[PDB]
Amino acid sequence: DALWEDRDVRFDLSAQQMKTRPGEVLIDCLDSIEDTKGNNGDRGRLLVTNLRILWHSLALSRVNVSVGYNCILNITTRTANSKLRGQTEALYILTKCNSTRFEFIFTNLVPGSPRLFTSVMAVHRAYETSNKQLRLLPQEHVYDKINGVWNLSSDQGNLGTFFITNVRIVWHANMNDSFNVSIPYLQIRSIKIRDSKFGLALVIESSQQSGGYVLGFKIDPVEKLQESVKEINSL
């Protein structure tokens, strides 16, 4: 139960269906599959999304466990069924990180979902495929252009150029090497201003990374630090 996310209590389900996360898009959903090497029984439903691939039970759906695209390495098919009551059904499981293996056997689907496999190749693929002009992500735009910022690293600080985007909040330095320093907004948890410490700066409280990245704005009369904290606390 190390990559089974909890659903009965942590997703607060009824007796029949899952609970959808914000921004989670559904494509297909089916039934009558077997799980092995979890902590479960023998039969239940099967749901899929753009962030999780979900097994709903049949008997006791107050035990219902799944995993998503954050942990899957690659996926397999069996073959196209040659003749006389075969199937195309194969769900075989490659964990990215841990040594747990799984086999998903649809117990009684009659064509075994040959067209759901035509979908599931692309939805893993989207999670696969993910001078100062930004390497811009799709569904992302630039909302501020700031020249002359002294980001002060643990090594040293230098002349730089800052951008404020929708998601990937990056910083460029034009000091002889074209640095890449980029954080996403979802890794940002909280923000504080440091006017006195290190000269009119902001510090970044990261949850997962557990580190702090600063910038620098005492280098010019800038009138943009109060512009900054509004955009980044909102978005």
Residue numbers in the entry: 5 to 134, 149 to 253
What does the paper say about this structure?
The BBSome is a cargo adaptor that recognizes a diverse set of membrane-bound ciliary proteins. It binds with its cargo to the intraflagellar transport (IFT) complex, a large heterooligomeric protein complex that is transported along ciliary microtubules by the molecular motors dynein and kinesin. We recently reconstituted a heterologously expressed core complex of the human BBSome, comprising the subunits BBS1, 4, 5, 8, 9, and 18. Here we report the structure of the human BBSome core complex at an average resolution of 3.8 Å for BBS1, 4, 8, 9, and 18 and 4.3 Å for BBS5.
In addition, the resolution is limited in this region, indicating a high degree of conformational flexibility. After three-dimensional sorting we also resolved BBS5 at a resolution of 4.3 Å and combined its density with the reconstruction of the full data set to build an atomic model. BBS5 is composed of two PH domains that both interact with the β-propeller of BBS9. One of the PH domains also interacts with BBS8 and with an unstructured loop of BBS9. In the BBSome core structure, the PH domains are laterally rotated by 90° to each other. Like PH-GRAM and GLUE, BBS5 was shown to bind phosphoinositides, with the highest preference for phosphatidylinositol 3-phosphate (PI(3)P) and phosphatidic acid (PA), which was suggested to be crucial for ciliogenesis. Besides BBS1 that indirectly interacts with membranes via Arl6, BBS5 likely mediates the contact to membranes by direct interactions with phosphoinositides. Since the BBS5 and Arl6 binding sites are located on opposite sides of the core BBSome complex, a simultaneous membrane binding of both motifs would require a curved membrane surface, as it is present on the inner cilium wall, and/or conformational rearrangements of the complex. The observed dynamic properties of BBS5 are probably the prerequisite for the subunit to be able to reorient and position one or both of its PH domains closer to the membrane, thereby enabling interaction with the membrane.
